[PDB]
């Protein structure tokens, strides 16, 4: 039997049955899966801030109590009003309207586009902004490296660092995630006394107690250069430099 009328009936019958099941899963779990993605970053933001958090309920409670996203305009360096909670900067950079093309000389970090408005997170403590977390990303040797930089109220001291997305080769370029290396970033000064970028990644180690010198990655100069460019670009005019300048003069407080 190869009746056309019957064949359509089974095809439609199968479509309806599968459609109900698939549609229910897509909508029923939409809210739960959205929470999962946010929870992952929320934990990462807490990790760099130094606030210990374990457990999904713990992450939500600590994140709400202390962290506070705030939009910031790169060109002006001042705060902005909007949906800072769910401002997907990555997608904004892709869109031409919300992104500004970078010229060859300007694009020190080798990123094609930069979003018009960035997003930061103030680590409030007792109704007082203890530190500000800046999402800075730059081009590595293999892929794009994204990291969070913690800066004190003075806007000059680095209180931490973490790379939540990298694709460098493990052992050579993947050391950026090494706890020892990240813990070595604490205490460095982003800017010199002249208010210009000073953080450096010196090959073959750094002088003991260097204020702006950071030990480089062994045998991974190319990745280290990308890290240096990322800090240099994002600390300049096109980056959070204007915002950090406001932070230096008590912008947060």
């Amino acid at each position: 039997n190869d009746s056309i009328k019957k064949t359509l009936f089974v095809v439609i019958a199968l479509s309806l049955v599968c459609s109900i099941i698939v549609s229910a899963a897509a909508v029923g779990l939409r809210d739960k899966q959205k929470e999962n993605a946010a929870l992952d970053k929320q934990s990462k933001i807490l990790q760099v801030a130094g606030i210990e958090a374990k457990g999904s309920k713990q992450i939500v409670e600590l994140f709400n109590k202390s962290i506070e996203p705030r939009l910031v305009d790169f060109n002006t360096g001042d705060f902005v009003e909007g949906d800072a909670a769910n401002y997907d900067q990555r997608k904004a950079a892709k869109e031409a309207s919300e992104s500004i093309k970078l010229t060859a000389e300007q694009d020190k970090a080798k990123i094609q586009r930069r979003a018009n408005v960035g997003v930061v997170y103030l680590v409030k403590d007792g109704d007082k902004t203890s530190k500000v977390i800046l999402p800075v990303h730059g081009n590595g040797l293999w892929s794009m490296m994204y990291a969070f930089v913690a800066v004190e109220t003075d806007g000059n001291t680095v209180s931490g660092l973490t790379y939540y997305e990298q694709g460098e080769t493990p052992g050579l370029g993947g050391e950026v995630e090494n706890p020892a290396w990240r813990a070595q970033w604490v205490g460095k000064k982003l800017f010199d006394e002249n208010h210009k970028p000073a953080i450096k990644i010196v090959k073959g180690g750094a002088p003991q107690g260097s204020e702006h010198g950071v030990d480089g990655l062994s045998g991974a100069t190319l990745t280290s250069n990308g890290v240096q460019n990322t800090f240099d670009f994002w600390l300049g005019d096109m980056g959070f430099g204007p915002f950090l300048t406001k932070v230096r003069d008590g912008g947060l407080n």
């Binding site: 064949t7 359509l8 095809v11 439609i12 309806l16 459609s19 698939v22």
Partner: protein, 408 residues
């Protein structure tokens, strides 16, 4: 609640559109017209059928029957049709039994090629002579401990236009029989009761077709004789499924309706003058008589033939007088037999030992030029396996060697 509705309708829309285009695609891209098969370019012999299936089924339905010893699957390779065009390329399985030269000549496996488009094929006129017959069982009396002689009568007295040493395919439907029902004469029942073979039973769920050599020569009109061997379970494997067709055949009695197909066969005597040596074994005695009788009765051949058949005792040796009369009437041909395990009641005093060894000592030991002879082998694999090497021990060539394997 709201997005689900859009998803559900969209879900059906994309899938419904896809089936429509492909369903519509077939309607205007593939033809549903029936396929016509031309036999020998003869308008009378034209077969028309819908697409699907294999070529073998179409031929059988029309009426022309092709050998199907393996019943499909590309195992025996007997099915060979000269398809001039069409039928697609040749599958790897077909190449197993078909060489590059044969494939170039157009030979193909009907049971493997699938009818999908108009094609033309050439077949020899001898195939048209193949037909089915419902022969009444004249008798199925026992002749040996493990062999039976099935005598059949062709309806209306017609004779099968077959060549000496050919075979026919007997088809039996689903059934269930018991070895107890077998009517084993007490002469051959001694060994049957020794191992209690009567306990086994045969059950068939679907029709089964098997090949069987005929012991009657072409000029024997209106009778078919088959030396069917009993395919009892091996002693090391007693509980394994007993022989289905063999159990069915041994259960037959006089007057039973027997369905056969043919005539088939390729184990035919060559047309030369070189001496032919026949080596028989088990059920293989049937072609030997046909070849021997045909060379003397039909062909009247004066050539020099030497037939040696292996048996276990006097009761397992049969047709002694049939060949002895030929020896008296034909001294050019000589017949022999060897008893490996003569029994006390045999009173045997002639040849002793296995057939393969004895014949070489008496005939091929002193032979000046035994290489040129023609060797016809038909018997159990061990008898054939030893003889081929034993023949090859005498520096024999494989061009003349023609093995009639029974699959034992």
């Amino acid at each position: 609640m709201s997005t689900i509705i859009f998803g559900v309708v969209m879900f059906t829309l994309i899938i419904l559109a896809l089936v429509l285009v492909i369903l519509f695609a077939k309607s205007k891209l593939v033809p549903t017209g029936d396929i016509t098969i031309s036999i020998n370019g003869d308008p009378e012999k034209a077969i028309v059928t819908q697409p699907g299936g294999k070529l073998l089924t179409a031929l059988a339905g029309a009426g022309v029957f092709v050998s199907s010893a393996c019943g499909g699957g590309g195992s025996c390779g007997q099915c060979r049709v000269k398809i001039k065009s069409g039928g697609g390329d040749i599958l790897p399985t077909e190449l197993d039994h078909i060489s590059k030269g044969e494939a170039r000549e157009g030979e193909r496996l009907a049971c493997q090629v699938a009818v999908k488009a108009d094609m033309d094929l050439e077949l020899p006129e001898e195939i048209f002579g193949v037909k089915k017959w419902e022969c009444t069982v004249i008798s199925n009396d026992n002749k040996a401990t493990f062999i039976k002689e099935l005598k059949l009568a062709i309806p209306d007295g017609e004779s099968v236009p077959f060549r000496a040493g050919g075979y026919i395919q007997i088809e039996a439907p689903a059934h269930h029989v018991k070895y107890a029902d077998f009517d084993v004469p007490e002469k051959y029942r001694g060994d049957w009761d020794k191992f209690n073979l009567f306990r086994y039973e045969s059950k068939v769920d679907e029709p089964i077709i098997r090949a069987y050599s005929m012991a009657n020569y072409p000029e024997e009109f209106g009778i078919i004789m088959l030396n069917v061997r009993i395919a009892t379970p091996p002693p090391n494997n007693p509980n394994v499924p007993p022989g289905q067709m063999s159990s069915y055949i041994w259960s037959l009695k006089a007057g039973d309706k027997c369905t056969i197909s043919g005539p088939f066969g390729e184990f035919f005597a060559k047309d030369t003058d070189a001496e032919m040596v026949f080596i028989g074994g088990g059920a293989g005695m049937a072609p030997m008589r046909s070849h021997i009788f045909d060379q003397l009765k039909r062909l009247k051949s004066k050539r020099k033939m030497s037939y040696w058949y292996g048996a276990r005792s006097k009761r397992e040796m049969f047709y002694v007088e049939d060949f002895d009369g030929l020896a008296a009437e034909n001294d050019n041909f000589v017949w022999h037999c060897a008893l490996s395990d003569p029994q006390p009641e045999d009173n045997w005093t002639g040849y002793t030992g296995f057939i393969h060894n004895v014949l070489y000592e008496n005939y091929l030991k002193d032979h000046e030029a035994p290489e040129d002879c023609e060797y016809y082998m038909c018997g159990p694999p061990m008898m054939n396996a030893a003889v081929i090497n034993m023949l090859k021990n005498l520096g024999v060539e494989e061009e003349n060697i023609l093995l009639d394997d029974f699959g034992g």
